[PDB]
Coordinates of C-alpha atoms and ligand atoms in Angstrom, one line a residue:
Chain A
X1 CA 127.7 72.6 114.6
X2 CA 126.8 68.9 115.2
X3 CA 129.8 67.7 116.5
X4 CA 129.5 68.4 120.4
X5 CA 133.0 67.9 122.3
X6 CA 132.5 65.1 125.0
X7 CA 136.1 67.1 127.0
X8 CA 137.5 70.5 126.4
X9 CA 141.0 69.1 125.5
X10 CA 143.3 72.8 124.1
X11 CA 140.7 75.4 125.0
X12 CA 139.3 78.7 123.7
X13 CA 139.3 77.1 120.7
X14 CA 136.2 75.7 119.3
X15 CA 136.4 72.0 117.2
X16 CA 135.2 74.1 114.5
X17 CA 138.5 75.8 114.2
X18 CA 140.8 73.1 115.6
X19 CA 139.7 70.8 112.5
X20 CA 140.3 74.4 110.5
X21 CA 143.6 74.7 111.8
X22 CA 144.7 71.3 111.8
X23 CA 143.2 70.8 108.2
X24 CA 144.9 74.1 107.0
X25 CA 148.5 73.4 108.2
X26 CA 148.7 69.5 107.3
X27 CA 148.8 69.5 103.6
X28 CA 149.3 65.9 103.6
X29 CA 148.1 63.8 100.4
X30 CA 146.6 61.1 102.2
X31 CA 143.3 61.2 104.0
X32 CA 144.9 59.0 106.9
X33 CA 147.9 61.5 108.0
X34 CA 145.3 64.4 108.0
X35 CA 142.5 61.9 110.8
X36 CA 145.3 61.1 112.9
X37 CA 146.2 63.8 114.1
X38 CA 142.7 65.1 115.0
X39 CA 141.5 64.1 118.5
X40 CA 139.0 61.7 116.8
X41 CA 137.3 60.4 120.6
X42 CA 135.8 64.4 120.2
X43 CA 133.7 63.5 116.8
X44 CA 131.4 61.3 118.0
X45 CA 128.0 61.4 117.5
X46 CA 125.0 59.1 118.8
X47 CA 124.5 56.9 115.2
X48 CA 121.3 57.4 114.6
X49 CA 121.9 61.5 113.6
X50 CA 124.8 59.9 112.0
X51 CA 122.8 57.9 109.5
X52 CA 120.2 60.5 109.1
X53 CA 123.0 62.3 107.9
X54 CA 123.4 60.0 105.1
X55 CA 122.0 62.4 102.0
X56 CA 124.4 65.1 103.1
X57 CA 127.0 63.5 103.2
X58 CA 126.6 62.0 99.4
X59 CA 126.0 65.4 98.1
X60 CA 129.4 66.4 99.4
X61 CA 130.9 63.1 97.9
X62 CA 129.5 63.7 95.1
X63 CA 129.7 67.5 94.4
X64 CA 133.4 66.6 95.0
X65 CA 133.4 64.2 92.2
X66 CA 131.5 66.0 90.3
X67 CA 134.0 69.1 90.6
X68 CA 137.3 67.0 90.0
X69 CA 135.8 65.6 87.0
X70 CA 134.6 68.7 85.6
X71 CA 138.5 70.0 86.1
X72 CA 140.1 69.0 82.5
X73 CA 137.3 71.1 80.6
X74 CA 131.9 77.3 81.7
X75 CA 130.3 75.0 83.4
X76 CA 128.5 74.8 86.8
X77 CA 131.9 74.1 88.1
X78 CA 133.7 76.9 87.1
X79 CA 134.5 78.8 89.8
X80 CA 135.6 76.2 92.4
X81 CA 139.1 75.3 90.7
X82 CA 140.4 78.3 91.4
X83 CA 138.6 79.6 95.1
X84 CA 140.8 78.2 97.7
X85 CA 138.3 78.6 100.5
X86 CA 135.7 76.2 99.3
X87 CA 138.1 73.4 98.3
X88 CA 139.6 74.0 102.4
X89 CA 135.6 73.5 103.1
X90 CA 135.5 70.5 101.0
X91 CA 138.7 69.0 102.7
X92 CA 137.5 69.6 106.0
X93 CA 134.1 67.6 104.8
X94 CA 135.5 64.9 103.2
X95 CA 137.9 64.5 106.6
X96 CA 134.8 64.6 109.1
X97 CA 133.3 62.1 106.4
X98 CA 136.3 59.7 107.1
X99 CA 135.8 59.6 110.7
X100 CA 132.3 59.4 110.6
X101 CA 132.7 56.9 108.5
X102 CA 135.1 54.9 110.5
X103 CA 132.2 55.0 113.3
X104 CA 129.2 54.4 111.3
X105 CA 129.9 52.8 107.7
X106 CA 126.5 53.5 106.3
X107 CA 126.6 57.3 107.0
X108 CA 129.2 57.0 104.0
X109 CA 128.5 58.7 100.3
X110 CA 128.4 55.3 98.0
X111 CA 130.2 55.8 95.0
X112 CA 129.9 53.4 91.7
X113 CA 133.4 52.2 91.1
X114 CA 135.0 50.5 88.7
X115 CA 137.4 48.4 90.3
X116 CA 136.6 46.7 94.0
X117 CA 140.1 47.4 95.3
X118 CA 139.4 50.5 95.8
X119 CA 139.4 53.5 98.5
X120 CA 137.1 56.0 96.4
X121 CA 137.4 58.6 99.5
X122 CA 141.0 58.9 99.8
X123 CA 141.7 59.5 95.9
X124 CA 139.0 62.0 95.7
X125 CA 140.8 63.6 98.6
X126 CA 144.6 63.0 97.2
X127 CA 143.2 65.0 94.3
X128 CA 141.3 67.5 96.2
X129 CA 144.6 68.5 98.1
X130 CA 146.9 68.5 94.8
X131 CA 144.5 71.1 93.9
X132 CA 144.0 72.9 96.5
X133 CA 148.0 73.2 97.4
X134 CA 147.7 75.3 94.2
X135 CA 144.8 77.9 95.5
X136 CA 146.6 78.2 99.2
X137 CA 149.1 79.6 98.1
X138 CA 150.3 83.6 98.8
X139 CA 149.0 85.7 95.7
X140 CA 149.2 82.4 94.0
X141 CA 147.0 82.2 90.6
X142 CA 148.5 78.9 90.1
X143 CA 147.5 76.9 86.8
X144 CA 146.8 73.0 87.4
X145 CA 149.8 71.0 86.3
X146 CA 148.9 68.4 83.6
X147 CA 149.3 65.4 86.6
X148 CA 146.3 66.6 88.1
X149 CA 144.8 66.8 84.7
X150 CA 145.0 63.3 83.4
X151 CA 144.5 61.8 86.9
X152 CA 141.2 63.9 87.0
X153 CA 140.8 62.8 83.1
X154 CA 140.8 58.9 85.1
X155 CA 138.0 59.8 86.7
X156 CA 134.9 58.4 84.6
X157 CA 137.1 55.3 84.4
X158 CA 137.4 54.8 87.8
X159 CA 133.9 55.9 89.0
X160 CA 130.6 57.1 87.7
X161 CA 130.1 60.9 87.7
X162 CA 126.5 61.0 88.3
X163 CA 124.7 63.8 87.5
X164 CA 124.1 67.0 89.5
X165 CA 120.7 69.3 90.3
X166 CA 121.5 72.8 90.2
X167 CA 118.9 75.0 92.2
X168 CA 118.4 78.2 90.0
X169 CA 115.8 76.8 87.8
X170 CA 115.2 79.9 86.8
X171 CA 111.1 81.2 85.9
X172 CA 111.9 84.7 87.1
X173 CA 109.9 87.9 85.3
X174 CA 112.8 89.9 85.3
X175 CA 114.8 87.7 83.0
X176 CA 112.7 87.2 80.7
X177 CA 111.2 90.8 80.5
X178 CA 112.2 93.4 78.4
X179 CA 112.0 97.5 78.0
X180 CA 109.4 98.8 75.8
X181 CA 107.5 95.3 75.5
X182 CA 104.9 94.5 78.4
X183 CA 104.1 90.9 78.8
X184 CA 100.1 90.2 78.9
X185 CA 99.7 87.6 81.1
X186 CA 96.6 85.3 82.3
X187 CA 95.9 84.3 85.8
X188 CA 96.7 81.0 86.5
X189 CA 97.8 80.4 83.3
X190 CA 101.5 80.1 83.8
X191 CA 104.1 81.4 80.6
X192 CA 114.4 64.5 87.2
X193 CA 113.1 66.2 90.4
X194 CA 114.4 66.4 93.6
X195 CA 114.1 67.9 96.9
X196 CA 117.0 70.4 97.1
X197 CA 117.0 70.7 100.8
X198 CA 117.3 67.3 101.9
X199 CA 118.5 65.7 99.3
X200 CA 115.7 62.9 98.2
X201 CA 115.1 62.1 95.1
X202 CA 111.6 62.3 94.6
X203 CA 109.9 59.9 91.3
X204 CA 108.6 61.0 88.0
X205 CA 105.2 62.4 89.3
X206 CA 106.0 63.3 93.1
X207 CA 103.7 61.5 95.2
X208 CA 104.0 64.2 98.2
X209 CA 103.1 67.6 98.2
X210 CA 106.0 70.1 98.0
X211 CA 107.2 73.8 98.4
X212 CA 108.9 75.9 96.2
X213 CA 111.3 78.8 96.5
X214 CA 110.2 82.4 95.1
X215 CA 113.4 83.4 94.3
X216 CA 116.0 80.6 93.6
X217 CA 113.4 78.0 92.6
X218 CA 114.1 75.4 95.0
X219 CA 111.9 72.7 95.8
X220 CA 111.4 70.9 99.2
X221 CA 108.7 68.6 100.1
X222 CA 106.4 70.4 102.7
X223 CA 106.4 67.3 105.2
X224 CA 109.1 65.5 107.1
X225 CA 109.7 62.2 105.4
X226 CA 110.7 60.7 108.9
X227 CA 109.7 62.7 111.9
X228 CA 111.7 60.2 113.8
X229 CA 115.0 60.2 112.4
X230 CA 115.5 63.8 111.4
X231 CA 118.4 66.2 111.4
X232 CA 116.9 69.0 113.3
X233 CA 119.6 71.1 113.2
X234 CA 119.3 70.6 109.6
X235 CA 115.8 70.4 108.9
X236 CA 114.7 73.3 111.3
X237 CA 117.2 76.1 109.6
X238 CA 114.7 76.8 106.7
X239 CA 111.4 76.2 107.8
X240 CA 110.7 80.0 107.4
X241 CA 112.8 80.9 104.6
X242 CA 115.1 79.5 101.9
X243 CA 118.7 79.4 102.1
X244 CA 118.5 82.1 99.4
X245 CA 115.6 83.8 101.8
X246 CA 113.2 83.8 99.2
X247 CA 109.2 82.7 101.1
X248 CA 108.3 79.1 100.8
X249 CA 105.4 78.5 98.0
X250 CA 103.2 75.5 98.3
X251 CA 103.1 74.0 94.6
X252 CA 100.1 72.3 93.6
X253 CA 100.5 68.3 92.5
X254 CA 100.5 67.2 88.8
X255 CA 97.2 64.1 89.1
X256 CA 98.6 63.4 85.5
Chain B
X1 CA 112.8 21.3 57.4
X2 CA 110.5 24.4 57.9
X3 CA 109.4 23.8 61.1
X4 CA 112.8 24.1 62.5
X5 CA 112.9 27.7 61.0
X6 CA 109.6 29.1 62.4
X7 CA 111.1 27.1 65.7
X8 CA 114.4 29.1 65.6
X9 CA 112.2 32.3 64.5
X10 CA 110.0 31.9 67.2
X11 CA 112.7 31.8 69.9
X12 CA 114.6 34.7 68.6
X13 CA 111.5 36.5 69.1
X14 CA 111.4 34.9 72.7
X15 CA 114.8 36.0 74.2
X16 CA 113.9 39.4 72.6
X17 CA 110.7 39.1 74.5
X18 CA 112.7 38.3 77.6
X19 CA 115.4 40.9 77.5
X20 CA 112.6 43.9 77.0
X21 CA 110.8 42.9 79.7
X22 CA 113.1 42.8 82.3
X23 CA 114.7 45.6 81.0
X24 CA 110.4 46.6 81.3
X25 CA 110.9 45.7 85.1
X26 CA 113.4 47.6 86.3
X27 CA 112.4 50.6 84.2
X28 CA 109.1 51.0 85.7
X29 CA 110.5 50.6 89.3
X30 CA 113.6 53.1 88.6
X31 CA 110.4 55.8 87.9
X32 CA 108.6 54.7 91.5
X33 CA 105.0 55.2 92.0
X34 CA 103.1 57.8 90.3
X35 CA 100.1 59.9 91.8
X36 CA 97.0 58.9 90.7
X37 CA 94.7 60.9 92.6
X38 CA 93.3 58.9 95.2
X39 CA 96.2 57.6 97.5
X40 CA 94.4 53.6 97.3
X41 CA 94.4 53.9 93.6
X42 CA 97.9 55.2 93.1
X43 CA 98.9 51.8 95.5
X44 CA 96.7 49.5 93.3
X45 CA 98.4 51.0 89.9
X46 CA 102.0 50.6 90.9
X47 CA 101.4 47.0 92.8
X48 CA 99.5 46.1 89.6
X49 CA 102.2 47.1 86.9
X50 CA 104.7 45.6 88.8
X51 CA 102.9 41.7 89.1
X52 CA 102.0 42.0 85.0
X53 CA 106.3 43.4 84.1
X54 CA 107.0 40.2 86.4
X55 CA 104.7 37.8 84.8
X56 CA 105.3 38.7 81.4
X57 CA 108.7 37.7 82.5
X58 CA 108.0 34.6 84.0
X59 CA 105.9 33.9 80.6
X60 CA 108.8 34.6 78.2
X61 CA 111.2 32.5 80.5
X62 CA 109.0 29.8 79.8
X63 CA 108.0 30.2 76.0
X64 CA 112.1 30.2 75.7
X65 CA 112.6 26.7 77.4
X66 CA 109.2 25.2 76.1
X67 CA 111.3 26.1 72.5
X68 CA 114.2 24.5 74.1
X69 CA 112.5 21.4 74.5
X70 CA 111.1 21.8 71.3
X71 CA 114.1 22.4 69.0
X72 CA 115.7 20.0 66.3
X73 CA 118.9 20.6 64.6
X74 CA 132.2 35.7 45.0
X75 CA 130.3 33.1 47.1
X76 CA 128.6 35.9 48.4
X77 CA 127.0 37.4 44.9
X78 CA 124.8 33.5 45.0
X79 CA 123.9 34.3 48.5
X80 CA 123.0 37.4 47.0
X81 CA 120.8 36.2 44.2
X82 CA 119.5 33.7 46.1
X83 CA 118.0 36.2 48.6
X84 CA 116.7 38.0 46.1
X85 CA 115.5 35.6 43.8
X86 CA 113.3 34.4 47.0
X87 CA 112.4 38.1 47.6
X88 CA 111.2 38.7 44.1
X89 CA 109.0 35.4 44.0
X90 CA 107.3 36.6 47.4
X91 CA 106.6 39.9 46.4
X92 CA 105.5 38.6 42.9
X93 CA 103.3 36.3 44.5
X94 CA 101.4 39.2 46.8
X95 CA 100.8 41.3 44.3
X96 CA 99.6 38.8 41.8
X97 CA 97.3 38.1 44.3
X98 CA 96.2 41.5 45.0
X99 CA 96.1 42.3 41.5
X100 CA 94.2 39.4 39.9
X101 CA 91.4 39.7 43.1
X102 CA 90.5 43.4 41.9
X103 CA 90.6 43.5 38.0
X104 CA 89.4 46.3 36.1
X105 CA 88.7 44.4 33.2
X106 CA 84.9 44.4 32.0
X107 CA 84.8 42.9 28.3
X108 CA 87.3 41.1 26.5
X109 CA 86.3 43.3 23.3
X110 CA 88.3 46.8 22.7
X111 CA 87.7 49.5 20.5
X112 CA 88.4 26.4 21.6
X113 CA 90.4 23.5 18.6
X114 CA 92.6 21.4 20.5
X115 CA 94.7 18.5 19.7
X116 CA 93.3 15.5 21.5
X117 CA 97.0 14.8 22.5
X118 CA 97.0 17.5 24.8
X119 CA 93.7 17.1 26.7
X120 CA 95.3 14.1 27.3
X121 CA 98.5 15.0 28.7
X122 CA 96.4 18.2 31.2
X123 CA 94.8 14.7 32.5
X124 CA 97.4 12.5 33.0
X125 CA 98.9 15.1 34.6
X126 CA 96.2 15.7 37.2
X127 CA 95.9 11.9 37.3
X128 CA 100.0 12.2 38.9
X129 CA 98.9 14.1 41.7
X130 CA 96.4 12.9 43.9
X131 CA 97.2 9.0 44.6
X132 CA 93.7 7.8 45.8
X133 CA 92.3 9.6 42.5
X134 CA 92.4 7.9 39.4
X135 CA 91.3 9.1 36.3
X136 CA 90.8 6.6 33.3
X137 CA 90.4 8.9 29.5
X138 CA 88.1 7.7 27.0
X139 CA 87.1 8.6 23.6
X140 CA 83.5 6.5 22.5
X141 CA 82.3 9.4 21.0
X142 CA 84.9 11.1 18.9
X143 CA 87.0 14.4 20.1
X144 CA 84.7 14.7 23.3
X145 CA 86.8 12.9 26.3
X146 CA 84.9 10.8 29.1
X147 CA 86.9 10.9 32.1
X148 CA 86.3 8.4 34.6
X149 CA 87.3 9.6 38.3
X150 CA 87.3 7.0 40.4
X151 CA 87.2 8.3 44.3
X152 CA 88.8 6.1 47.3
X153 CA 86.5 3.5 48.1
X154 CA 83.3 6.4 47.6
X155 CA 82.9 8.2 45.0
X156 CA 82.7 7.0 41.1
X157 CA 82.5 10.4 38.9
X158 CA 81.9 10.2 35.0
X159 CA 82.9 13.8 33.6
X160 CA 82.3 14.4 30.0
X161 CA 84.5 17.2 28.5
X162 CA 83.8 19.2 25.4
X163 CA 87.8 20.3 23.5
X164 CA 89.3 20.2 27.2
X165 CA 86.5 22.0 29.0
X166 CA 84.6 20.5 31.3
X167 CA 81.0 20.1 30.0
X168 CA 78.7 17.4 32.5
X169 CA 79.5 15.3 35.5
X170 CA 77.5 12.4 37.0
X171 CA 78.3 11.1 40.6
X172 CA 77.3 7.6 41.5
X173 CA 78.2 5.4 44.1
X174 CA 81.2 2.8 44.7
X175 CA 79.2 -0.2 43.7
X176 CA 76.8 1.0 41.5
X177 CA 77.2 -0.8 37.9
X178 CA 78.4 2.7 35.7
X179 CA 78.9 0.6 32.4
X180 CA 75.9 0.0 29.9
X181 CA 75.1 -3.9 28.6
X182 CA 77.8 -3.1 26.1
X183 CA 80.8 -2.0 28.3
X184 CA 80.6 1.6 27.6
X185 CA 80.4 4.4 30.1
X186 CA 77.1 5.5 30.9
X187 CA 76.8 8.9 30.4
X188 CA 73.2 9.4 31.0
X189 CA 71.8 8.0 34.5
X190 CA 71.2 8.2 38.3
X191 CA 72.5 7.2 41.1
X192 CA 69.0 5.5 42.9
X193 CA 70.3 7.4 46.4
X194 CA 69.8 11.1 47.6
X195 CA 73.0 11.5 48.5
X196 CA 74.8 11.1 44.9
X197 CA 72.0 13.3 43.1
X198 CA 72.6 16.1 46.0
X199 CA 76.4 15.7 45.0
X200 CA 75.8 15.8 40.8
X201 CA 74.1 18.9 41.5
X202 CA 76.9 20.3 43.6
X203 CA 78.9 19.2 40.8
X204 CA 77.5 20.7 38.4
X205 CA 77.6 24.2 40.5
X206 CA 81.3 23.0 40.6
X207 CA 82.0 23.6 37.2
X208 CA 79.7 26.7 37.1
X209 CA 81.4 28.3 39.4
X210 CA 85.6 27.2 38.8
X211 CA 85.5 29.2 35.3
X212 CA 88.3 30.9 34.1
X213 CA 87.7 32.5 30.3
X214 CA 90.9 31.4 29.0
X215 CA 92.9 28.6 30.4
X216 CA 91.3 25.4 31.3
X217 CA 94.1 23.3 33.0
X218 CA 93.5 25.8 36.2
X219 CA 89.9 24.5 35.9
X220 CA 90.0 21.2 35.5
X221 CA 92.7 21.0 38.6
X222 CA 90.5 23.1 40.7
X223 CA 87.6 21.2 40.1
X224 CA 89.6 17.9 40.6
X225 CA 91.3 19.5 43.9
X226 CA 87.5 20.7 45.0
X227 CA 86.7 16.7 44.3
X228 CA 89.0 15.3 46.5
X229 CA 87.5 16.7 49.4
X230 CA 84.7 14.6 49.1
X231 CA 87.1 11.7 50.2
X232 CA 85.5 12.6 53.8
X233 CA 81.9 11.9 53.3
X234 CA 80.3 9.9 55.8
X235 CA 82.9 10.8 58.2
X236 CA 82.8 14.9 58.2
X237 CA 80.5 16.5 60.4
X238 CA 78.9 20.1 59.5
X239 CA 80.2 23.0 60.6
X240 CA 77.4 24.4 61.4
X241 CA 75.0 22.0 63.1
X242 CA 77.7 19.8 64.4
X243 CA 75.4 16.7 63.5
X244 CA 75.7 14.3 60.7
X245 CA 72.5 13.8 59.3
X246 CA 70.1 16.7 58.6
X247 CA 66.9 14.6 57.0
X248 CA 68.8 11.6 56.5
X249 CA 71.7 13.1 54.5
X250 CA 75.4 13.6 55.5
X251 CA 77.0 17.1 54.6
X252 CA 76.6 17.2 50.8
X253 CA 78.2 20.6 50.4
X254 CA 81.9 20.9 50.3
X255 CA 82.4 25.0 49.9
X256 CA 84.8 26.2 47.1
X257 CA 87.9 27.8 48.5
X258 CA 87.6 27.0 52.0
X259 CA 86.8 22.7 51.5
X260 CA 84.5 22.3 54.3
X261 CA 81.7 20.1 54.9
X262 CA 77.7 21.7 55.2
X263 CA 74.4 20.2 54.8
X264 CA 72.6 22.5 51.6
X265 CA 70.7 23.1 53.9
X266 CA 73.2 24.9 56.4
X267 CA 74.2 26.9 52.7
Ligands
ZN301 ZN1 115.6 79.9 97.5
ZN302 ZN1 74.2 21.2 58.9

């Protein structure tokens, strides 16, 4: 939605669907054959939006890190290997990273690496498309081939896999319920964090006040950090709702 | 020499020391700042962790070169023994200590004759140690030994022992005449100054007090260890009134155990 073409250059379609297009038919390896051929004067944005994009952007690097190094093992990963859809999302990302990132450099995921010779971006996206050449296929249910698996097993040696927040923290009745036993509750009695949303990590004890979800459990802090330099677009989606579209709940702070 | 050890010790403990707390550092600003109820005293908290991490640092950087400038410069089974050989004698030497300070003894009943020879070896013994002490035996009066114990340029002590056990002492001054008309010691007299009758009294408490039932070469070396102390009269001051002279005396009373100088007066 951000990316706003300066000139309509091949109408009726949309940039949405010309990177769709474009990203769907090149199945190029390299991240540099795929940003060539993609009219990159049209995704240009103003660079301050482009920096404020900046958490974003590393929970996409990083979710795709996380994902190829979760390959050679159920885990919260699971179900991406195989979905061809999301790894074409996570393509198309990681491509509109690149250019953004030729633009601005400091809108760019940072990735811990073990080597300084190194173009982290383009080998998590070599990877990305030598697995997702498996899942595009035509009634495919193509197995991984074991080059993918001990390049993906070089993974923690090239870079840190960080570590991952995954919203369903999960306090829900319903789970923990049971026929023919009622639970006797008190009132007010109640039977490493983020902010899920934008992605800031808040500290031990938050400092700022914060909103939880009803239903997933996601927690987003009730203020803008920067009412400046804030991604509108981004920011103003769920001020009603969650993404899940359980109500916002204001959560009372710790004092420890 | 031991000083190097306790040096080399000591600076172990110091990069340890250093190592923690920067490691101290940077754990308490990877957390960030806490709440604290009230948003000022949340500020002061962190601002105030952070200055002590950093000058514990900048304190153990120092300790470490201070030490710096400081500093001086089958096999296996000896090593072995050797280690615990000194192990052994530590922990033989604690709990002799605890043990003999809390006896549960209370009579020596359930349900003295010594050669001369050896009183004088125990003496001449003593007399090795302690160079500015000397100790002259004699016999005037059969088995009983006189011991003069001559003390620096100060002190001129007559003990009289009874089979290796000491009996009387009389202290008396550097010049005063301590022979008779005759050349013998004499045993019964006074010293015509305050100071060396405050000290034969202390004396005598000296021997009341240093008694062991059994052996007597402990005694007699404690006593003669609690007598060398008195090598700093006229020159200690008390550690209580800080002054010299309390009535026109100097500190009379060297304590048993701890050797320090008090008027009698100051207990
Ligand atoms: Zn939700
Ligand atoms: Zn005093």
């Amino acid at each position: 939605s951000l990316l706003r073409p300066h000139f309509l250059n091949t109408p009726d379609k949309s940039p949405g669907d010309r990177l769709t297009e474009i990203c769907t038919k090149i199945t190029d390896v390299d991240i540099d054959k795929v940003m060539i051929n993609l009219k990159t004067e049209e995704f240009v944005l103003d660079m301050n939006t482009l920096q404020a994009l900046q958490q974003l952007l590393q929970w996409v690097g990083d979710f795709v890190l996380y994902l190829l190094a979760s390959l050679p093992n159920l885990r919260p990963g699971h179900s991406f290997l195989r979905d061809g859809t999301s790894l074409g999302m996570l393509r198309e990302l990681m491509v509109v990273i690149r250019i953004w990132g030729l633009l601005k450099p400091s809108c760019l995921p940072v990735y811990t690496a073990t080597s300084d010779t190194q173009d982290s971006m383009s080998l998590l996206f070599r990877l990305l498309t030598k697995l997702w050449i498996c899942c595009r296929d035509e009634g495919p249910a193509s197995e991984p081939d074991e080059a993918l698996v001990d390049e993906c097993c070089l993974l923690p040696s090239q870079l840190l896999i960080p570590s991952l927040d995954w919203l369903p923290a999960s306090d829900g009745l319903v789970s923990r319920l049971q026929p023919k036993q009622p639970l006797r509750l008190q009132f007010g009695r109640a039977p490493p964090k983020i902010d899920h949303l934008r992605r800031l990590h808040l500290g031990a004890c938050p400092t700022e006040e914060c909103k939880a979800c009803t239903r997933c459990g996601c927690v987003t802090m009730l203020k803008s950090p920067n009412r400046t330099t804030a991604v509108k677009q981004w920011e103003q989606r769920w001020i009603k709702n969650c993404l899940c579209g359980g109500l916002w709940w204001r959560v009372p702070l710790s004092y420890p | 020499v031991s000083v190097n050890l306790e040096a080399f010790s000591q600076a172990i403990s110091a990069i340890q020391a250093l190592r923690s707390s920067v490691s101290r550092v940077f754990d308490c600003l990877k957390d960030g700042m806490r709440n604290k109820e009230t948003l000022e005293g949340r500020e002061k908290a962190f601002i105030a962790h952070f200055q002590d991490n950093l000058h514990s640092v900048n304190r153990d950087l120092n300790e470490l070169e201070r030490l710096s400038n400081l500093v001086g410069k089958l096999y296996s089974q000896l090593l072995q023994a050797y280690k615990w050989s000194n192990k052994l004698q530590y922990h033989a030497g604690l709990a002799s200590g605890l043990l003999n300070q809390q006896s549960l003894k209370r009579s020596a009943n359930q349900m003295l004759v010594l050669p001369p020879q050896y009183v004088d070896d125990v003496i001449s013994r003593i007399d090795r140690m302690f160079p500015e002490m000397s100790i002259h035996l004699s016999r005037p009066n059969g088995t009983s030994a006189m011991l003069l114990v001559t003390l620096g340029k100060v002190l001129k002590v007559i003990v009289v022992m009874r089979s290796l056990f000491i009996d009387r002492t009389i202290v008396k001054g550097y010049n005063e005449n301590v022979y008779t008309e005759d050349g013998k010691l004499d045993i019964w007299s006074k010293s015509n100054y305050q100071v060396f009758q405050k000290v034969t009294d202390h004396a005598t408490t000296a021997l009341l007090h240093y008694q062991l039932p059994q052996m007597p070469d402990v005694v007699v070396r404690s006593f003669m260890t609690w007598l060398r102390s008195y090598i700093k009269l006229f020159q200690a001051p008390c550690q209580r009134c800080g002054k010299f002279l309390q009535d026109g005396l100097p500190p009379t009373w060297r304590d048993f155990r701890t050797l320090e100088a008090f008027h009698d007066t100051c207990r």
